[PDB]
Each structure stands twice: as C-alpha cells, then as structure tokens.
C-alpha cells in the first residue's frame, strides 16, 4: 500500500522534526530573562475618542504617517480619520456592508477592504474628480475574505476562508500565486518588516510561514489548542505572536523553529481577538472578548497593565509606526486612542 | 479659536460628513433584516422568487416596510467564524422541504435529508448569538409531500411515528418535531407556515410574523413583556 507507506514516512518525518526541536531547548526565555528588570505598571489614558460609526467595528488600520487611520463598520462605511483633530477626512460607502477586513496602503494612495462577498475591493483616494473611487475589484476567492495587507501599491495579499492565501497583482486583477497547506479557514496575516516573508494563522490551531516570492511554506508552527484568530510579527522579524480562543498568546521563534513563550492568566477565559507589539517589542498588547485590552511584558509574561473602557468585545488593535499611540476599536461602535 | 483658515474649513467638511452619516443611519434604522437559511434543495429559491459566490442580498417592499433578506448559503466555510455578523438580524427564515422525508444525502446514503434539516435547524436555533431571535419556518413542497405520504410512511425517517399516512397528520407531526428542538421556548418563537410553489400568501405571512417580532421587542424595552 503506497498510501500506508507514505503515511508512515510522514510520521517518521514528524518524529525527526520534533526531536530537532527538543534538541534546541537548552533553556527557555522565562529563565534567560529572570535578570531583566520588569517594565513596571503601565497606565495609559484615553486621549481621543472617535465617534461616527453606527455599527460594530470589525477592522482598523493605521497609515504610515501615524496620523491617519481607516476603520470599517457593518453599516457599509469606511472612514478615514485624522487622529490628531478627530475630524473625518473621508467616508466611503461600500457596495456591501459585510466588511471584515480593511487595509491602508503604505504610500497612502489606496484603501482595501472586504468580507462576506468573497472579494477584495480597492479604493483610490487620490483623484481629479475629488471623490473616492473603486479602482479595482479582486475576485477568485471562494470563501470569505478574512484579511488584506498591501506590500506596495501594485500588490496585495489576502487570506480567505477557502483555506488559501493569495498574492494579487492589482494592475491586472490577477492572482499571481496561491498558498496552500492550511486545512481550516485562514484567519489572519502579518507581513514581515522587509516584505519577504509573511505568516498566516488559521483554524487548524497552527500557523505557517510563507515565502512571498517562492510561493512556498517554509515552516509550520503549532501548539495552540484552538483556532488562531490574531497574528503579529515581532519588530525584528525573527519572531511572531499568535492569539487564539484558548485565551493564550504565544510567542514563536523563527530561528529555533519552536515556541518561546506563553502568556496566560487563570482569570482570563475570553478569547483573543487581536494582538500587537510596541516599537521595541517589549510590550505585547492583546484585545479580548472581556471588553478589555491587556498589556504584557513580552519578555517575562507578566501583565504590565490593563486598558479598559469599551462596552463590548474589542475587535481590533493597532500601534502607530512611530510608537506614539495605541488605538483600539470595538463592537460598541467607538475607536479610542490611548497614550 | 486659534484655527487657521484651512483648519476651520476642514472642520466644516467633517461636520457635513457627520450629517450625511446620520441620514443614512436613519434610513437603515427603519429596515427589516431577515436571514435566509436552508439546506440544499429546500425551496429557498422558491421563497425568494415569491418574495420579489458570496452573500446574496434581496430587497423587497411590502405595505411600506422595506425588507432586506440575506442568502448566506453556498459558503463552504465555518459558520462559527462569521455567524455573529448577523446577531442583530430581526428574524431568521428557515426553509425545509417536506418531501425530503424519504430522501438521503448524495454524500451519505444512510443519512436522511430530513434529519440533516433538523440538525441544521437545531444548530442555529440554540446558537448563543440567536438567543432572542425568532424563526420563521417554511415547510415547503406540501403538495409533493401529500402525493408521497400515501406511498411511503413517515416511519422511514421517524420510526417512532404512529399516526395515519394522511397529509394532515404527518405534516403536523413534522411541524412538532421541529418546534420541539427549541430549548428557549420561553424566550423565542417559531412561526410555522406550510407552503408550496403556488402560494401568494408567503409575503403576508412573513410581514405579519415580523410585525409581531418588532412589537414584542419594543414592548420588552418598555418594561412590559
């Protein structure tokens, strides 16, 4: 039986990978960092409250300038906001209200979004007419669109419930490559700081590192007990943090090919909806169905502090590129900026 | 106020945006959102025709009320990872064909389509997000059911059934078994209407069921149950 033999071979290969890993575990992060002074309590105040959405917020993104933010709500509107003055810059009606993900181009020229339509729409914010227009629609996914990230103005990467992730060429509307290997719906994407690699989290309680150019899965990370809902890349680009329904964040290392640390607490049973890191990566932030967001000492796994003030599930987090502020968005219809 | 001429202008523009957002909100606030759920060839399409790759939205107006219906079928993904989006839907419309009682799934010769419908019904009725959302249930293809029941007893799907092979009894029994799947009998309601391909009363039925759902919910918020 070719099939049985192949399955046995696969089991043997998995055994080799497991041992390769236990071979690198001389000590852990929680031991090497014992001589590192704790951050201490972190207290952050709300500085700005952004009002306007009349529905649950599903996604938010920060522009590279660190002053402009895009938010999406189920009332069919994207809003671009000047965070400093709370003024709205644009309000973009959508062709459908079922929006689950939104992104801001690094240049600031385009905004992408989508969800239960199974397509990704790209809007052009710089026009002669003066109004915002759809420049293109990307279709070819067969499941809902769970996440969109721009590499550059002509390239966007998407993840979908059809279990696949795809790199699209915006000029032609074509899918140029497809990533396969996940078996569950794919929940989230994060790009490496240099754009050369990206990580996809999925409902297989695993995550995969994918080479963008080579279209292949370099490494598979596992160990979560439930679906991974949020993923972030450590600022160096050599590590990543994943959140899941287990109420546990986990830090993985790309060079050891192994989990480095877990963040958990006995009183947290709510799932993790979002994860983010500070500029230095010393602080890890996570949003929970508890209506709160908890800062964590990323090197010690102690709780450093708590943000609170939402009346519903926190759906999204983001940290500006310059590290000056943290934004949180929620089902209560409000986005708050803390510092 | 310290603002420059351009900053003052920017604020005026922001205010106009808010004004327009409020007007769109007012219109949305007056619409009825219905969710259409059915299994396979349940006659869901027939219902859609009578009323008027991703989610499909149908808009119809009856007696000055605007209804938006979402067909969320054909999504081969995890319902759990997107079902919450419909938490605020006014009501759920579920379609089950009655003729399906003697049929099995192509994918599983031993799985009765009618039991598959009941499993689906149960998975949505008792869902956490739908604790207080009522269900409008359409038992369709009653004419094929009447033609078939005289040949095959319901015991082919319900071995426990012990009634006559008459349409009027078998159909009532099927209705009961769906109604019996409601754990929250004291919180949500199941409206049932037997239907067929030639039934012009389906719109009035949905309208009346929706009307009761809205009034009952407005009363709950006034402190009167």
């Amino acid at each position, epitope marked *: 039986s070719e099939l049985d033999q192949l399955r046995q071979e696969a089991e043997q290969l998995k055994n080799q990978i497991r041992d390769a890993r236990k071979a690198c575990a001389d000590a852990t992060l929680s031991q090497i960092t014992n001589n590192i002074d704790p951050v201490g309590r972190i207290q952050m105040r709300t500085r700005r409250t952004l009002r306007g959405h009349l529905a649950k917020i599903y996604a938010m993104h920060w522009g590279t300038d660190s002053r*402009l933010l895009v938010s999406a709500s189920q009332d069919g509107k994207l809003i671009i906001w000047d965070s400093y003055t709370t003024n709205k*810059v644009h309000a973009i009606p959508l062709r459908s209200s079922w929006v689950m993900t939104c992104a801001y181009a690094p240049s600031g020229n385009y905004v992408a979004c989508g969800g239960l339509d199974n397509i990704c729409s790209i809007y052009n914010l710089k026009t002669r007419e003066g109004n915002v227009r759809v420049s293109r629609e990307l279709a070819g996914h067969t499941g809902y669109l769970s996440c969109c990230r721009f590499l550059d103005d002509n390239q966007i990467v998407t993840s979908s419930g059809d279990t696949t992730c795809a790199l699209w060429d915006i000029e032609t509307g074509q899918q140029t490559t497809t990533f396969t290997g996940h078996t569950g719906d794919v929940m989230s994407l994060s790009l490496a700081p240099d754009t050369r690699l990206f990580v996809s989290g999925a409902c297989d309680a695993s995550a995969k590192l994918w080479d963008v150019r080579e279209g292949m899965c370099r490494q598979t990370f596992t160990g979560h007990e439930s679906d991974i809902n949020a993923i972030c890349f450590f600022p160096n680009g050599n590590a990543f943090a994943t959140g899941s329904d287990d109420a546990t964040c986990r830090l993985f290392d790309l060079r050891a090919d192994q989990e480095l640390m877990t963040y958990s607490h006995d009183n947290i049973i709510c799932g993790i909806t979002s994860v983010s890191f500070s500029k230095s990566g010393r602080l890890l932030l996570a949003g929970y169905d508890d209506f709160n967001c908890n800062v964590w000492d990323a090197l010690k796994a102690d709780r450093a502090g708590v943000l609170a003030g939402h009346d519903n599930r926190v759906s999204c987090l983001g940290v500006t590129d310059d590290g000056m502020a943290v934004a949180t968005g929620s089902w209560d219809s409000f986005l708050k900026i803390w510092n | 106020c310290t603002l420059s001429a351009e900053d003052k202008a920017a604020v005026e523009r922001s205010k*106009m945006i808010d004004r327009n957002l409020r007007e769109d909100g007012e219109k949305a606030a007056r619409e009825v959102k219905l969710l259409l759920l059915g299994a396979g060839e349940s006659g869901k399409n027939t219902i859609v025709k009578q009323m008027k790759t991703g989610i499909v939205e149908t808009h119809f107006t009856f007696k000055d009320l605007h209804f938006k219906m979402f067909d969320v079928g054909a999504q081969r993904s995890e319902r759990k990872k997107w079902i919450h989006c419909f938490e605020g839907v006014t009501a759920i419309i579920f379609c089950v064909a009655l003729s399906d009682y003697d049929l099995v799934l192509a994918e599983d010769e031993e799985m009765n389509r009618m039991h598959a419908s009941m499993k689906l019904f149960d998975s949505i009725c008792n869902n956490k997000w739908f604790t207080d959302t009522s269900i409008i249930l359409f038992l369709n293809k009653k004419d094929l059911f009447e033609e078939k029941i005289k040949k095959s007893p319901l015991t082919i799907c319900y071995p426990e059934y012990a009634g006559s092979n008459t349409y009027e009894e078998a159909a009532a029994y099927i209705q009961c078994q769906f109604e019996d799947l409601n754990k929250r009998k004291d919180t949500k309601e199941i409206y049932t209407h037997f239907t067929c391909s030639t039934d012009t009363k389906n719109v009035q039925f949905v309208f009346d069921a929706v009307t009761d759902v809205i009034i009952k919910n407005n009363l709950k918020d006034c402190g009167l149950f």
Partner: single-chain antibody
Framework: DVQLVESGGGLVQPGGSRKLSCSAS????????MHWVRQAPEKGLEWVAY????????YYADTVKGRFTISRDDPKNTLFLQMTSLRSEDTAMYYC??????????????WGQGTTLTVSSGSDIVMTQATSSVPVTPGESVSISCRSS???????????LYWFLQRPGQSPQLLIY???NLASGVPDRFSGSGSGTAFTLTISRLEAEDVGVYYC?????????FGAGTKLEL
C-alpha cells in the same frame, strides 16, 4: 477632464449690474468650495469671494462687500457672482477657482478660463515680491522670493504659502502648496523653501514653458492676498 467654464462677461455702464456664471464639469462640485479671483489689466490677482461646500461660509473682499453676492447651485453644478453698482475699478478678468480643504488636500489646483468684464467710464497680510522681473536663459537656476507682513507659520506647523504660475494667455496654475509641497502634474525642477516671513521658489533647468509671471499667495486668514508677481523673461 475637469472643466470650469465661465460666462456672462461683456460691457456694462457704471452703476449697472451683471451676473457672472461658472459652469462646472468633470468633478464633484458639491464637495469643492469655490472662489472668485479677479485680475485687472494691471496683471495683479485679487481675491473677490468665497463660497464653501454646502454654502455654509461666505467671505467677501472688503472692496466688493455689499455689492457682490456669491451663490452656488449644486444640482446644476453652477457658481454665480451677482455684481451690482458696478464701478470702473471692477473692470477685470474673473476666474472661477476650485478648492477643497481636508488634511493633505491641495486647494486652488484648478482654475477656469474666466470672463472679461468691462465697465465704462490695514489689518490685511501684505506680501511683497521685491523683484518685478528676472531675465533667464534655458538651463539656468532661478530664485524667486516673497516676503510677508507676518509669519505664515502656524502653531500646527504648516506654513500657508502657495505659488502660482501664469503663462501668457493662460490661467494661473498651482506649483507649490503650503510652502514645500509640489502640485500634481508639476515637474520636480520647481521647489519651494522658506522660513518665517521669507520664502523662496527655486527653479532649475529652466525651460521655455517655465517663463511666465509667478505669484506668491497668503492663506492664513481672509482676505487671501497675493503679491505683485515676478516676471521671468527670455
């Protein structure tokens, strides 16, 4: 493409009245605030009036206040100037100018062609263009300066200075907005550098197209004001 076509000019006797009209095509008229700028035969641009998007705010120059009314009809995409009690000084070419304000916008980018109106028989910020003209030749570097009565810098950190180029027989065109930013469709050779009350526009690799009159504009407060203009020649 974007168009503004003014009409309603002609000859009027003093004390009489005319109504000017600016039809708008190719853009969302409702979202854009509109201005009227007049250039007399003296070739010095003067701001006349402003109507905001939605008609919420209207400002007029002191000279025309009470004799001129600005109105917009968004459904017909038209901008109107009602001129009454016309005086000889009112003779000029009137330009309809497009402007939108939000963070990162670039107002005054699009100018109409204008109409000609002929009429028979101290707190303002003042800007000076010390040089009335500069002879230039192709390939050379050119420095055009402007000075202001008060600093155009603001607490927000934005210096509100705009540079416009009017080629002969053509409407003025924005080159630089807010001191250092280049307008779309403007070659990289043009650059703007300034501090406080003193500003410089630097043109490199000069070309025949570049030759024309250059105007500095103040936009910190109303009235908006312009300098005299510097002419390049040769």
């Amino acid at each position: 493409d974007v168009q503004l076509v003014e009409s309603g000019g002609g000859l009027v006797q003093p004390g009489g009245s005319r109504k000017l009209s600016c039809s708008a095509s190719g853009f969302a008229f409702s979202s854009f605030g509109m201005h009227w700028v007049r250039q007399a035969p003296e070739k010095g641009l003067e701001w006349v009036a402003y109507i905001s998007s939605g008609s919420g705010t209207i400002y007029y120059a002191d000279t025309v206040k009470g004799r001129f009314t600005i109105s917009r009809d968004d459904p017909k995409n038209t901008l109107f100037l009602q001129m009454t009690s016309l005086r000889s000084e009112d003779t000029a070419m009137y330009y309809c100018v497009r402007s939108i304000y939000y963070y990162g916008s670039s107002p005054f980018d699009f100018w109409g062609q204008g109409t000609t109106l002929t009429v028979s028989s101290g707190s303002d910020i003042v800007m000076t263009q010390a040089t009335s003209s500069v002879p230039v030749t192709p390939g050379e570097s050119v420095s055009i300066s402007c000075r202001s009565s008060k600093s155009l810098l603001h607490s927000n950190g934005n210096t509100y200075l705009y540079w416009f180029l009017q080629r002969p027989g053509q409407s003025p065109q924005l080159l630089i907005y807010r001191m250092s930013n280049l307008a779309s469709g403007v070659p990289d050779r043009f650059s703007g550098s300034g501090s406080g009350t003193a500003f410089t526009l630097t043109i490199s690799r000069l070309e025949a197209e570049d030759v024309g009159v250059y105007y500095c504009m103040q936009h910190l407060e109303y009235p908006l004001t312009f300098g005299a203009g510097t002419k390049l020649e040769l």
